[PDB]
């Protein structure tokens, strides 16, 4: 059963080349109603759905250690994005799908990981990125990686305009190889959905 369909709201994603789902650090969420919001937080399901982002083009010239990152949340022009501008505090986890579509004649390997409290890693530290929740993408085996993570941080609710707890990271483990029958490059995309979205502290309007 390499076939998987994921649903988030009124959006679905179906992949026929998956190696399952990796859950990071936990399988459920910490308590979303703590003392810091005095019972004024509310959930917004209309924001729990997939949004898209191109990460990069995986080409043969990129070597081991080449790293691409996406700090979350990122600019969002839909419901979720509106919440970031209209409420002072928020919390949510992430349902992350990364795809790298070439063909089975390509070779190589990408590491896909979710990193809490991103800091630029030194070359030597890249050898240990597997300490973070991750999966690999190798054209001979899969085109999709899927990671699910909960919200975390020193604070139970956050101000995303000031702090991004999670960072999606894609790193080249072994360079893309090409044949006469393979793809020449692979475009890597992310399909992300925020999960268990809660907001607190409605802000005034700007007009």
């Amino acid at each position: 059963d390499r076939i998987l369909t994921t649903r988030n709201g009124h959006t679905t994603s179906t992949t026929q080349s998956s190696v399952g789902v990796t859950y990071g650090y936990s399988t459920q969420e910490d308590h979303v109603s703590g003392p810091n919001t005095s019972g004024l937080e509310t959930r917004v399901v209309q924001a729990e759905r997939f949004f898209k982002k191109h990460l990069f083009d995986w080409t043969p010239d990129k070597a081991f250690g080449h790293l691409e990152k996406l700090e979350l949340p990122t600019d969002h022009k839909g419901v979720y994005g509106f919440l970031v501008d209209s409420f002072a505090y928020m919390r949510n986890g992430w349902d992350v799908e990364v795809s790298a579509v070439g063909n089975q004649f390509n070779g190589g390997c990408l590491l896909v990981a979710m990193v809490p409290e991103w800091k630029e890693f030194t070359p030597r530290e890249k050898y240990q990125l597997t300490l973070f929740p991750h999966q690999f993408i190798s054209p001979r085996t899969n085109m999709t990686a899927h990671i699910v993570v909960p919200y975390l941080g020193v604070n139970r609710y956050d101000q995303y305009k000031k702090h991004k707890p999670w960072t999606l990271v894609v790193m080249v483990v072994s360079p893309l190889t090409t044949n006469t029958v393979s793809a020449g490059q692979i475009k890597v995309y992310a399909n992300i959905a925020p999960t268990h979205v809660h907001v607190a502290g409605e802000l005034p309007s700007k007009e």
Partner: protein, 190 residues
């Protein structure tokens, strides 16, 4: 829903897949017996006329749905506006019989004559297309009899208790627009 397309197994996905809810449907208006059960015009007439449902207009509601089936069966009702007396003979009768009163003959009564007729073909069902000869056109035996009067001005036919078998292509108007076929839909005046 993901499936093997090549096998051509019917697959009906629903809105439930992404959280919607499938509603209740009422399909009486697309019921076959019901939709074919209404009068339509025949148009090409002569004082001696063999009743052939294939003379309905090919784009007419009944004519088009009929041609969208290969085989069919039905009884019939006809409305005829004629001068003189109207005589009808069953499938297989010699044309000469149309002149005699011993055959169902309706004496003129304004404004027209409406009659219920049974299916009289020698075949278990009739067809709208026939790939062959009987001696492209259809075999002569595919008819509901013939009528004759001094003058036949108008003829309407109505299929009763219709049965249709083996669907065939049914086409809407072709679109040149590049987006939608647009036409004047009825709307209140002023």
């Amino acid at each position: 829903t993901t499936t093997t397309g090549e096998s051509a197994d019917p697959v009906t996905t629903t809105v439930e897949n992404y959280g919607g809810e499938t509603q209740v449907q009422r399909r009486q208006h697309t019921d076959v017996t019901f939709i074919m059960d209404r009068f339509v015009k025949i148009q090409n007439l002569n004082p001696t006329h063999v009743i052939d449902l294939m003379q309905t207009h090919q784009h007419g509601l009944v004519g088009a749905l009929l041609r969208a089936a290969t085989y069919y069966f039905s009884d019939l009702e006809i409305v005829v506006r004629h001068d003189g007396n109207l005589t009808w003979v069953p499938n297989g009768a010699p044309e000469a019989a149309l002149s005699n009163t011993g055959n169902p003959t309706a004496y003129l009564k304004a404004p027209f004559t409406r009659l219920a007729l049974p299916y009289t073909a020698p075949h278990r069902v009739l067809a709208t297309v026939y790939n062959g000869t009987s001696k492209a056109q259809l075999p002569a035996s595919f008819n509901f009899g013939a009528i004759q009067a001094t003058t036949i001005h108008e003829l309407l036919v109505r299929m009763k208790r219709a049965e249709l078998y083996c669907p065939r292509p049914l086409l809407a108007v072709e679109v040149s627009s590049q987006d939608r076929h647009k036409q004047k839909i009825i709307a209140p005046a002023k």
